[PDB]
Amino acid sequence: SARIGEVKRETKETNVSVKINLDGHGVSDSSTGIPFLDHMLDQLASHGLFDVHVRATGDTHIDDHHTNEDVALAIGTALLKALGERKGINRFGDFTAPLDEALIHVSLDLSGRPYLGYNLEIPTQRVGTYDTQLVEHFFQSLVNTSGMTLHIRQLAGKNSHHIIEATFKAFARALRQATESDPRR
Amino acid sequence: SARIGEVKRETKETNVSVKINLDGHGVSDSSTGIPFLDHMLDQLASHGLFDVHVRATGDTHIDDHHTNEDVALAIGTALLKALGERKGINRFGDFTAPLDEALIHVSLDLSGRPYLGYNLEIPTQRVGTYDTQLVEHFFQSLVNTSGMTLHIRQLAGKNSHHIIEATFKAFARALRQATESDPRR
Amino acid sequence: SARIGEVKRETKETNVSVKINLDGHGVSDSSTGIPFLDHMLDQLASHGLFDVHVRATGDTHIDDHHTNEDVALAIGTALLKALGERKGINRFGDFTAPLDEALIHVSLDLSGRPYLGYNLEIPTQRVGTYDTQLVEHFFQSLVNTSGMTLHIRQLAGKNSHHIIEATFKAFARALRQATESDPRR
Amino acid sequence: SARIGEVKRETKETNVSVKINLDGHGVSDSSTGIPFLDHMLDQLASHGLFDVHVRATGDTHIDDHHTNEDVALAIGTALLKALGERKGINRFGDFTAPLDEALIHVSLDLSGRPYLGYNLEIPTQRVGTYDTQLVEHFFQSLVNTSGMTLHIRQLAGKNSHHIIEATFKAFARALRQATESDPRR
Amino acid sequence: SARIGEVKRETKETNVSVKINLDGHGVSDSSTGIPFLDHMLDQLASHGLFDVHVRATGDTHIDDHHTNEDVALAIGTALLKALGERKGINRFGDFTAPLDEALIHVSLDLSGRPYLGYNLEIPTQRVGTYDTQLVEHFFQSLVNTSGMTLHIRQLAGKNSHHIIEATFKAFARALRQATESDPRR
Amino acid sequence: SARIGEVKRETKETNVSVKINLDGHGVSDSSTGIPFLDHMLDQLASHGLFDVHVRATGDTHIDDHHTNEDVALAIGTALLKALGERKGINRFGDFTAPLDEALIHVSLDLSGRPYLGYNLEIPTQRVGTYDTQLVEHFFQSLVNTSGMTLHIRQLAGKNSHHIIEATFKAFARALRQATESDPRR
Ligand SMILES: [Mn+2]
Ligand SMILES: [Mn+2]
Ligand SMILES: [Mn+2]
Ligand SMILES: [Mn+2]
Ligand SMILES: [Mn+2]
Ligand SMILES: [Mn+2]
Ligand SMILES: [Mn+2]
Ligand SMILES: [Mn+2]
Ligand SMILES: [Mn+2]
Ligand SMILES: [Mn+2]
Ligand SMILES: [Mn+2]
Ligand SMILES: [Mn+2]
Ligand SMILES: [Mn+2]
Ligand code: NA
Ligand code: NA
Ligand code: NA
Ligand code: NA
Ligand code: NA
Ligand code: NA
């Protein structure tokens, strides 16, 4: 039976609905009001073979910060719920993905202890309309509600969109690994 | 009886109305034409337990500078009027507020001698559409019309929205302390 | 009615029982198998006016690490439970406590978002038999389950016991402030 | 019943009489033969809400050193006497006070163990006729007879009169906090 | 017989009309499609007492560059035409203007030989939607068609809007002096 | 006819009377209890062609600080009063004055927004009995009550009396310029 986590979260600032299938086929269906984040969430589905359904509405006239954070928090919680008792899984994931000149190493453990190690150096302040400080906030928030240990290490990269997208490819692949069944467990 | 200060400031550039209640319940009612400043004025009301009413429009087609300044000047005057003869109050306020990784120490004295000490280092140029140079200008202008001695010291912080918002939290709580009754005066 | 949180948690490594009263009288009843940690828990009770009850049976023949961690995790959860809906509280706490030459500033927010900022430099590796690396882990683990934003800043200090104990005094006092009723809320 | 400490002390060099009320109304009555010190003692009364009565005569034809020291020693003893058994008090005090561009953080504990941490950098040698080295000596001597743990930290300042006066404001306010009743003890 | 210069110039990128009266009363009537430039041209009128009429229709969907340049070229030519044979004028101008923290020294000679000396350091990339690289280009183009020797020296300044606007105030006042009659010539 | 501003102000520390005529003939009538300040106020009258009447008494046995500050505050208020609506004036003033080896550039704007930029480096602590820190405090306090934008820049100088006196000559001549009628307004 497919492992599915669903979360509805309403704050003063944002309304968020998430549904994630750990055992999906890469179905991407994300609409957050933040086009660059939607693009990254599509990468998450396609490279992780998760089914990702996200809806958010919020106060983007202020900036994208509150929406970014609330989506990430909800996603972490959805992952936690989908994982259930975590029986018979690999638990650890490790992958290095390129995107042209960018190269990003992600290592993670579905440990129940939140930690983010992050060293990206994104050389521009905006990719499209997306504030590049929000990348770290997205992963930190996801970590805090999922309880995962996550290390994100930039090995190479110059183009901001390549650095971020390569990070999502590596994260998706590492998370696929961690959530898959270990054949000897 | 509640201490309420009301100010109309009209310049070539901006039309401003402010009403502040020092003895409020955190009623937030601010519309400046600058969404991020509206968000910070909400934080002022919420964290300081002030009632804050602001209406402004101006030449935002140029940039946010003139409106940001005229709003700040009028708030400073409003505070001055609300304080009246300052009988029986703490006068001094001192608070350090975190917001995640950010940590800001604000110390103030309702002295009648304007001074701004400010050392924030905001690492991005825009939060949403808000020019981060305007944060210092907001506090300088407020100080100049209120006659407040104000020091703002950045102890930690990386996210620009966090640093600015922690500053308003700390300022609001320090100002609440300073405007409150001293039980021995 | 007093705000009391109780946690019983057993792992492969440790068997822990914690009960904390936020509205206590400083009743101290901590026995962890780690004498220096018991001394610090006593400081928490006495300086915070919490009633603190801790029992732990752990694998200290290996080292104190698993016991220290499991105690801290359970305390964080106990605090979370005791706080309930967090209605009407100060929420923020800020205190700087000396102990002779040592001086430690603690600032915290009962935010629901875990974060530890810690900069202690403890110049010796052992205080009695207690590994001084475990101080940071204690606070990190406590933050992670309580969901608090916590900043610990060393302003002065040379004696390791003084540095660590001053940190617990300042923490206890900042947490007492945060958990107390705000008379205007 | 008001907590009052009285000291008479005669040395080869000076004759000093001190009376301090911890529970006063800011009555300032200091005549030491050192006008700048009188001015600082007035600040201590007004900002601390102590009643301060001081008389000293001595060998100021030599310099102000012996008088300054003997006044400080007597005040320390007077505080210790007034404190009595220290039942039910806050014991710790912490305050940061501005005076224009100056900003001074004082932290203290009524511990019974004397310690002075002092880092003021006063950039002129005389304020009026008062030797600026005597500021440190005043606080050191006070600490030695009171048994106080006292930390004085300069955060900002350029004007010598401002730096010293802000220190006395912050000290008076921290000391008031420490000597006041803790409502839960 | 006011000295009036008029230029109508159309390129494949822009269509521009400028009319300047050296002997004006500050009448400001500038619409370029670049709101910040219009604000600066208003400053030129107000502080210089020129009558300034500008209209431009340009390709601002690309960026403000071609419009900014073509407006500046046309203003330079209009000044040249207005000056005519330059009989009896001061010819040199020199003014230092503050705007809050900003302080800008402008020195010019209506010499017939184009030169721009410019050392502004504008610390942000955008003021509103206005690219701050365009300030130097405005003055360079103006110099090139007018044939003036112009030095712009930043003595102080932190806020980009203040730096640029002070530059325009100082330029306008220096140009007013240079274009005015020398009573002895 | 003549623009005259009068201010009487008494505090616990000082008693001050100021009368200034902006349209004077350099009548000098200053007695502050601080002989070097008297001499500088004489320079203000003679170089500015202001009529300057000042009387002050106060606690100079403590030091000259309170007197210096209260005189400057009163002067600033008196200038503000005398200026009235500020109709038809130059508003800006700019002058560089030598005194032997000293050279001081003063630039100011009668703007309504207080700002002091000050970089004097006065190499001795006392000129006669006058504490050289008081020069800066004089100008800061004057700016604060007058609402002027004032920049004081040391270009050269070694002798402390010369540096200070040149500053007052330049300030006086700049203020004369700013307060004089613009013949085209
Ligand atoms: Mn956030
Ligand atoms: Mn892409
Ligand atoms: Mn401005
Ligand atoms: Mn926010
Ligand atoms: Mn282990
Ligand atoms: Mn561990
Ligand atoms: Mn101990
Ligand atoms: Mn001695
Ligand atoms: Mn004083
Ligand atoms: Mn082009
Ligand atoms: Mn070009
Ligand atoms: Mn402007
Ligand atoms: Mn002062
Ligand atoms: Na398996
Ligand atoms: Na009161
Ligand atoms: Na409450
Ligand atoms: Na008590
Ligand atoms: Na002429
Ligand atoms: Na005029």
Author numbering:
A (entry chain G), B (entry chain H), C (entry chain C), D (entry chain A), E (entry chain E), F (entry chain D): 9 to 193
List sentences from the manuscript.
Imidazoleglycerol-phosphate dehydratase (IGPD) catalyzes the Mn(II)-dependent dehydration of imidazoleglycerol phosphate (IGP) to 3-(1H-imidazol-4-yl)-2-oxopropyl dihydrogen phosphate during biosynthesis of histidine. The metalloenzyme imidazoleglycerol-phosphate dehydratase (IGPD) (EC 4.2.1.19) has been identified as a potential herbicide target due to its essential role in histidine biosynthesis (Ames, 1957; Hilton et al., 1965). Since the substrate lacks a carbonyl or imine adjacent to the leaving proton, which is thus non-acidic, IGPD uses an unusual mechanism for catalysis that is distinct from other dehydration reactions that have been reported to date (Glynn et al., 2005).
To provide a foundation on which to analyze substrate binding, we determined the structure of A. thaliana IGPD isoform 2 (IGPD2) in complex with inorganic phosphate (1.75 Å resolution), which is a weak inhibitor of the enzyme (Ki ∼5 mM) (Wiater et al., 1971a). The native protein crystallized as the same 24mer species that has been observed previously, and this structure shows that within the active site of the holoenzyme, both of the Mn(II) ions are octahedrally coordinated by four conserved protein ligands and two water molecules; HOH3/HOH4 for Mn1 and HOH1/HOH2, for Mn2. The holoenzyme has an open conformation where the C-terminal region (R193–R206, termed the C loop), which contains a number of conserved residues, is disordered.
